[PDB]
PDB file of N, CA, C and O in Angstrom:
ATOM      1  N   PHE Z   1     -81.790  25.030   0.615  1.00 44.18           N
ATOM      2  CA  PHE Z   1     -81.121  24.129   1.992  1.00 44.18           C
ATOM      3  C   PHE Z   1     -81.835  25.329   3.189  1.00 44.18           C
ATOM      4  O   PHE Z   1     -80.636  25.993   3.537  1.00 44.18           O
ATOM      5  N   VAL Z   2     -82.710  25.659   3.768  1.00 45.74           N
ATOM      6  CA  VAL Z   2     -83.162  26.908   4.847  1.00 45.74           C
ATOM      7  C   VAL Z   2     -83.078  26.697   6.179  1.00 45.74           C
ATOM      8  O   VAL Z   2     -82.566  27.457   6.543  1.00 45.74           O
ATOM      9  N   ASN Z   3     -81.668  25.097   5.668  1.00 48.12           N
ATOM     10  CA  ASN Z   3     -81.122  24.853   7.377  1.00 48.12           C
ATOM     11  C   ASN Z   3     -79.741  24.190   7.217  1.00 48.12           C
ATOM     12  O   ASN Z   3     -80.302  23.184   8.267  1.00 48.12           O
ATOM     13  N   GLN Z   4     -78.978  24.587   6.390  1.00 48.04           N
ATOM     14  CA  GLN Z   4     -77.597  24.717   6.171  1.00 48.04           C
ATOM     15  C   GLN Z   4     -77.622  25.607   7.562  1.00 48.04           C
ATOM     16  O   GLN Z   4     -76.871  26.350   7.561  1.00 48.04           O
ATOM     17  N   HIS Z   5     -76.862  24.062   9.085  1.00 49.10           N
ATOM     18  CA  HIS Z   5     -75.502  24.755   9.586  1.00 49.10           C
ATOM     19  C   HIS Z   5     -74.041  23.084   8.728  1.00 49.10           C
ATOM     20  O   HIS Z   5     -74.409  21.949   8.720  1.00 49.10           O
ATOM     21  N   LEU Z   6     -72.806  24.106   8.951  1.00 49.79           N
ATOM     22  CA  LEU Z   6     -71.645  23.107   8.967  1.00 49.79           C
ATOM     23  C   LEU Z   6     -70.780  23.406  10.249  1.00 49.79           C
ATOM     24  O   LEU Z   6     -70.323  25.009  10.073  1.00 49.79           O
ATOM     25  N   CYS Z   7     -70.313  22.505  10.796  1.00 52.40           N
ATOM     26  CA  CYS Z   7     -69.491  22.641  12.008  1.00 52.40           C
ATOM     27  C   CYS Z   7     -68.284  21.906  12.255  1.00 52.40           C
ATOM     28  O   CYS Z   7     -68.937  20.669  11.537  1.00 52.40           O
ATOM     29  N   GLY Z   8     -67.679  21.990  12.597  1.00 50.65           N
ATOM     30  CA  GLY Z   8     -66.171  20.815  12.549  1.00 50.65           C
ATOM     31  C   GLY Z   8     -65.511  21.062  10.946  1.00 50.65           C
ATOM     32  O   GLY Z   8     -65.806  21.117  10.915  1.00 50.65           O
ATOM     33  N   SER Z   9     -65.944  19.019  11.366  1.00 48.08           N
ATOM     34  CA  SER Z   9     -65.110  18.531   9.777  1.00 48.08           C
ATOM     35  C   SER Z   9     -65.612  19.022   8.609  1.00 48.08           C
ATOM     36  O   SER Z   9     -65.602  18.821   7.433  1.00 48.08           O
ATOM     37  N   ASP Z  10     -67.703  19.055   8.481  1.00 47.39           N
ATOM     38  CA  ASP Z  10     -68.013  19.140   7.643  1.00 47.39           C
ATOM     39  C   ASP Z  10     -67.709  20.864   7.087  1.00 47.39           C
ATOM     40  O   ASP Z  10     -68.166  21.377   6.385  1.00 47.39           O
ATOM     41  N   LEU Z  11     -67.204  21.729   8.096  1.00 47.93           N
ATOM     42  CA  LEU Z  11     -66.756  23.470   7.525  1.00 47.93           C
ATOM     43  C   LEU Z  11     -65.661  22.687   6.930  1.00 47.93           C
ATOM     44  O   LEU Z  11     -65.568  23.246   5.919  1.00 47.93           O
ATOM     45  N   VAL Z  12     -64.804  22.177   7.689  1.00 49.51           N
ATOM     46  CA  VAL Z  12     -63.363  21.995   6.050  1.00 49.51           C
ATOM     47  C   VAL Z  12     -63.349  21.537   5.250  1.00 49.51           C
ATOM     48  O   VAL Z  12     -62.929  21.812   4.203  1.00 49.51           O
ATOM     49  N   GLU Z  13     -64.743  21.065   5.539  1.00 50.42           N
ATOM     50  CA  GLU Z  13     -65.167  20.193   3.776  1.00 50.42           C
ATOM     51  C   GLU Z  13     -65.530  21.175   3.119  1.00 50.42           C
ATOM     52  O   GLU Z  13     -65.290  20.864   1.656  1.00 50.42           O
ATOM     53  N   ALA Z  14     -66.634  21.788   2.808  1.00 51.15           N
ATOM     54  CA  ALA Z  14     -67.369  22.554   2.704  1.00 51.15           C
ATOM     55  C   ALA Z  14     -66.466  24.136   1.794  1.00 51.15           C
ATOM     56  O   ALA Z  14     -66.504  24.014   0.926  1.00 51.15           O
ATOM     57  N   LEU Z  15     -65.439  24.581   2.857  1.00 49.27           N
ATOM     58  CA  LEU Z  15     -64.176  25.143   2.489  1.00 49.27           C
ATOM     59  C   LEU Z  15     -63.627  24.321   1.242  1.00 49.27           C
ATOM     60  O   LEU Z  15     -63.191  25.367   0.474  1.00 49.27           O
ATOM     61  N   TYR Z  16     -63.244  23.311   1.755  1.00 45.60           N
ATOM     62  CA  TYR Z  16     -62.053  22.908   0.449  1.00 45.60           C
ATOM     63  C   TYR Z  16     -63.073  22.929  -1.116  1.00 45.60           C
ATOM     64  O   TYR Z  16     -62.582  22.826  -1.927  1.00 45.60           O
ATOM     65  N   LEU Z  17     -63.891  22.127  -0.830  1.00 41.74           N
ATOM     66  CA  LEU Z  17     -65.590  22.082  -2.228  1.00 41.74           C
ATOM     67  C   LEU Z  17     -64.960  23.207  -2.711  1.00 41.74           C
ATOM     68  O   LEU Z  17     -65.257  23.715  -3.259  1.00 41.74           O
ATOM     69  N   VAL Z  18     -65.244  24.374  -2.160  1.00 41.03           N
ATOM     70  CA  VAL Z  18     -65.389  26.114  -2.689  1.00 41.03           C
ATOM     71  C   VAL Z  18     -64.137  26.537  -3.060  1.00 41.03           C
ATOM     72  O   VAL Z  18     -63.893  27.243  -3.936  1.00 41.03           O
ATOM     73  N   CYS Z  19     -63.107  25.879  -1.993  1.00 38.08           N
ATOM     74  CA  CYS Z  19     -61.794  26.789  -2.788  1.00 38.08           C
ATOM     75  C   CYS Z  19     -61.112  26.918  -3.519  1.00 38.08           C
ATOM     76  O   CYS Z  19     -60.283  26.740  -4.279  1.00 38.08           O
ATOM     77  N   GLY Z  20     -61.451  25.493  -3.474  1.00 37.81           N
ATOM     78  CA  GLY Z  20     -59.966  23.833  -4.427  1.00 37.81           C
ATOM     79  C   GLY Z  20     -59.029  24.088  -3.957  1.00 37.81           C
ATOM     80  O   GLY Z  20     -59.152  23.926  -2.898  1.00 37.81           O
ATOM     81  N   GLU Z  21     -57.901  23.522  -4.849  1.00 37.30           N
ATOM     82  CA  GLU Z  21     -56.500  24.168  -4.362  1.00 37.30           C
ATOM     83  C   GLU Z  21     -56.035  25.367  -4.236  1.00 37.30           C
ATOM     84  O   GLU Z  21     -55.006  26.097  -4.149  1.00 37.30           O
ATOM     85  N   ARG Z  22     -56.712  26.357  -3.922  1.00 36.89           N
ATOM     86  CA  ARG Z  22     -56.200  27.976  -4.240  1.00 36.89           C
ATOM     87  C   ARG Z  22     -55.572  27.874  -2.257  1.00 36.89           C
ATOM     88  O   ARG Z  22     -54.976  28.935  -1.842  1.00 36.89           O
ATOM     89  N   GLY Z  23     -56.160  26.407  -1.340  1.00 35.45           N
ATOM     90  CA  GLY Z  23     -56.418  26.359  -0.060  1.00 35.45           C
ATOM     91  C   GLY Z  23     -57.201  27.422   0.304  1.00 35.45           C
ATOM     92  O   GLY Z  23     -57.753  28.755  -0.169  1.00 35.45           O
ATOM     93  N   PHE Z  24     -57.231  27.899   2.032  1.00 33.60           N
ATOM     94  CA  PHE Z  24     -57.894  28.592   2.720  1.00 33.60           C
ATOM     95  C   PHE Z  24     -57.210  28.786   4.365  1.00 33.60           C
ATOM     96  O   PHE Z  24     -57.249  28.211   4.869  1.00 33.60           O
ATOM     97  N   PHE Z  25     -57.968  29.781   4.972  1.00 32.30           N
ATOM     98  CA  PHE Z  25     -57.419  29.989   6.157  1.00 32.30           C
ATOM     99  C   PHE Z  25     -58.462  31.007   6.494  1.00 32.30           C
ATOM    100  O   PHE Z  25     -59.272  32.519   6.245  1.00 32.30           O
ATOM    101  N   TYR Z  26     -58.918  30.638   8.533  1.00 35.91           N
ATOM    102  CA  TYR Z  26     -59.485  31.523   8.706  1.00 35.91           C
ATOM    103  C   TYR Z  26     -58.277  32.369   9.864  1.00 35.91           C
ATOM    104  O   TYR Z  26     -58.184  31.811  10.825  1.00 35.91           O
ATOM    105  N   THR Z  27     -58.837  33.670  10.868  1.00 37.46           N
ATOM    106  CA  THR Z  27     -58.023  33.956  11.597  1.00 37.46           C
ATOM    107  C   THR Z  27     -58.180  33.241  12.571  1.00 37.46           C
ATOM    108  O   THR Z  27     -57.631  33.174  13.679  1.00 37.46           O
ATOM    109  N   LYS Z  28     -59.423  33.851  13.626  1.00 37.36           N
ATOM    110  CA  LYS Z  28     -60.182  33.453  14.501  1.00 37.36           C
ATOM    111  C   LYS Z  28     -61.763  32.947  14.637  1.00 37.36           C
ATOM    112  O   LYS Z  28     -62.722  33.373  13.358  1.00 37.36           O
ATOM    113  N   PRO Z  29     -62.260  31.380  14.895  1.00 39.82           N
ATOM    114  CA  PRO Z  29     -63.367  30.778  15.026  1.00 39.82           C
ATOM    115  C   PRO Z  29     -65.027  31.813  15.237  1.00 39.82           C
ATOM    116  O   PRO Z  29     -65.555  31.843  14.290  1.00 39.82           O
ATOM    117  N   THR Z  30     -64.315  32.980  16.000  1.00 38.32           N
ATOM    118  CA  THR Z  30     -65.579  34.038  16.644  1.00 38.32           C
ATOM    119  C   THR Z  30     -65.490  35.100  16.966  1.00 38.32           C
ATOM    120  O   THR Z  30     -66.133  35.796  15.874  1.00 38.32           O
TER     121      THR Z  30
ATOM    122  N   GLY U   1     -66.867  35.279  12.951  1.00 38.27           N
ATOM    123  CA  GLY U   1     -65.994  34.822  12.262  1.00 38.27           C
ATOM    124  C   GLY U   1     -67.083  33.894  12.171  1.00 38.27           C
ATOM    125  O   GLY U   1     -68.104  33.545  12.406  1.00 38.27           O
ATOM    126  N   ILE U   2     -66.186  32.990  11.410  1.00 41.44           N
ATOM    127  CA  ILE U   2     -66.667  31.627  10.079  1.00 41.44           C
ATOM    128  C   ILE U   2     -67.859  31.083  11.071  1.00 41.44           C
ATOM    129  O   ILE U   2     -68.245  30.040  10.571  1.00 41.44           O
ATOM    130  N   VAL U   3     -67.063  30.894  12.392  1.00 42.24           N
ATOM    131  CA  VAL U   3     -68.477  29.623  12.935  1.00 42.24           C
ATOM    132  C   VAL U   3     -69.454  30.223  13.329  1.00 42.24           C
ATOM    133  O   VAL U   3     -70.881  29.953  13.537  1.00 42.24           O
ATOM    134  N   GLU U   4     -69.891  31.790  13.984  1.00 43.11           N
ATOM    135  CA  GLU U   4     -70.956  32.147  14.025  1.00 43.11           C
ATOM    136  C   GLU U   4     -71.615  32.315  13.339  1.00 43.11           C
ATOM    137  O   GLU U   4     -72.595  32.582  12.417  1.00 43.11           O
ATOM    138  N   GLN U   5     -70.545  32.400  11.916  1.00 44.43           N
ATOM    139  CA  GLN U   5     -71.129  32.838  10.589  1.00 44.43           C
ATOM    140  C   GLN U   5     -71.977  31.693  10.233  1.00 44.43           C
ATOM    141  O   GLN U   5     -73.034  31.687   9.373  1.00 44.43           O
ATOM    142  N   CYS U   6     -71.049  30.282  10.104  1.00 44.54           N
ATOM    143  CA  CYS U   6     -72.301  28.520   9.401  1.00 44.54           C
ATOM    144  C   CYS U   6     -72.103  27.772   9.954  1.00 44.54           C
ATOM    145  O   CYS U   6     -73.089  26.912   9.331  1.00 44.54           O
ATOM    146  N   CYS U   7     -72.129  27.818  11.650  1.00 44.06           N
ATOM    147  CA  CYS U   7     -71.951  26.373  12.357  1.00 44.06           C
ATOM    148  C   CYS U   7     -72.966  26.915  13.209  1.00 44.06           C
ATOM    149  O   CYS U   7     -74.152  26.500  13.411  1.00 44.06           O
ATOM    150  N   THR U   8     -73.118  27.913  13.963  1.00 41.77           N
ATOM    151  CA  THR U   8     -74.012  28.361  15.234  1.00 41.77           C
ATOM    152  C   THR U   8     -75.388  29.789  14.666  1.00 41.77           C
ATOM    153  O   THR U   8     -76.353  29.213  14.866  1.00 41.77           O
ATOM    154  N   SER U   9     -74.765  30.261  13.367  1.00 42.03           N
ATOM    155  CA  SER U   9     -75.661  30.410  12.048  1.00 42.03           C
ATOM    156  C   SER U   9     -75.358  30.586  10.852  1.00 42.03           C
ATOM    157  O   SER U   9     -74.797  28.807  10.677  1.00 42.03           O
ATOM    158  N   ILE U  10     -77.160  29.984   9.916  1.00 40.86           N
ATOM    159  CA  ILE U  10     -77.135  28.967   8.702  1.00 40.86           C
ATOM    160  C   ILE U  10     -76.391  30.379   7.216  1.00 40.86           C
ATOM    161  O   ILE U  10     -76.813  31.360   7.747  1.00 40.86           O
ATOM    162  N   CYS U  11     -75.121  29.671   6.942  1.00 41.01           N
ATOM    163  CA  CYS U  11     -74.177  30.682   5.894  1.00 41.01           C
ATOM    164  C   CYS U  11     -74.906  29.231   4.970  1.00 41.01           C
ATOM    165  O   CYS U  11     -75.385  28.710   4.329  1.00 41.01           O
ATOM    166  N   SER U  12     -74.203  30.956   3.765  1.00 45.27           N
ATOM    167  CA  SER U  12     -75.023  29.960   2.286  1.00 45.27           C
ATOM    168  C   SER U  12     -73.420  29.893   2.380  1.00 45.27           C
ATOM    169  O   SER U  12     -71.686  30.678   2.471  1.00 45.27           O
ATOM    170  N   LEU U  13     -73.247  28.830   1.293  1.00 48.82           N
ATOM    171  CA  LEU U  13     -72.127  29.070   0.541  1.00 48.82           C
ATOM    172  C   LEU U  13     -71.022  29.250   0.454  1.00 48.82           C
ATOM    173  O   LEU U  13     -69.952  29.312   0.013  1.00 48.82           O
ATOM    174  N   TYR U  14     -71.912  30.227  -0.153  1.00 51.13           N
ATOM    175  CA  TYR U  14     -71.221  32.010  -0.606  1.00 51.13           C
ATOM    176  C   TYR U  14     -69.949  33.161  -0.661  1.00 51.13           C
ATOM    177  O   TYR U  14     -69.318  33.235  -0.681  1.00 51.13           O
ATOM    178  N   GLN U  15     -70.743  32.572   1.053  1.00 50.90           N
ATOM    179  CA  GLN U  15     -69.638  33.609   1.888  1.00 50.90           C
ATOM    180  C   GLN U  15     -68.394  32.618   2.464  1.00 50.90           C
ATOM    181  O   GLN U  15     -67.658  33.716   2.740  1.00 50.90           O
ATOM    182  N   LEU U  16     -68.887  31.011   2.309  1.00 52.21           N
ATOM    183  CA  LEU U  16     -67.584  30.592   2.511  1.00 52.21           C
ATOM    184  C   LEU U  16     -65.855  31.220   1.655  1.00 52.21           C
ATOM    185  O   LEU U  16     -65.403  30.888   1.386  1.00 52.21           O
ATOM    186  N   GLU U  17     -66.985  31.083   0.318  1.00 54.33           N
ATOM    187  CA  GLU U  17     -65.481  32.487  -0.551  1.00 54.33           C
ATOM    188  C   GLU U  17     -64.696  33.386  -0.112  1.00 54.33           C
ATOM    189  O   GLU U  17     -63.400  33.299  -0.979  1.00 54.33           O
ATOM    190  N   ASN U  18     -65.152  33.937   0.823  1.00 55.62           N
ATOM    191  CA  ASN U  18     -64.654  34.504   1.573  1.00 55.62           C
ATOM    192  C   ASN U  18     -63.512  34.523   2.329  1.00 55.62           C
ATOM    193  O   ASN U  18     -61.959  35.051   2.530  1.00 55.62           O
ATOM    194  N   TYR U  19     -63.157  33.182   2.957  1.00 54.16           N
ATOM    195  CA  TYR U  19     -61.972  32.611   3.258  1.00 54.16           C
ATOM    196  C   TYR U  19     -60.914  31.758   2.558  1.00 54.16           C
ATOM    197  O   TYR U  19     -59.987  31.502   2.396  1.00 54.16           O
ATOM    198  N   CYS U  20     -61.095  31.394   0.809  1.00 56.55           N
ATOM    199  CA  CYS U  20     -60.304  31.291   0.168  1.00 56.55           C
ATOM    200  C   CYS U  20     -59.080  32.275   0.046  1.00 56.55           C
ATOM    201  O   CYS U  20     -59.136  33.169   0.448  1.00 56.55           O
ATOM    202  N   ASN U  21     -57.743  31.832  -0.476  1.00 57.15           N
ATOM    203  CA  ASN U  21     -56.149  32.494  -0.199  1.00 57.15           C
ATOM    204  C   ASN U  21     -56.492  33.137  -2.085  1.00 57.15           C
ATOM    205  O   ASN U  21     -56.198  34.035  -2.476  1.00 57.15           O
TER     206      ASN U  21
END
């Protein structure tokens, strides 16, 4: 997908599909 | 950070692997 952007709830959904039940975190948005 | 990587830039789902615990 040349033009993929993941914001808000889409970003949480995509992290959960990639990481499974390992869990995930990010320390700062930017 | 993840928002500049994937929200205000185009990201590869592969880069999300960096955020897994």
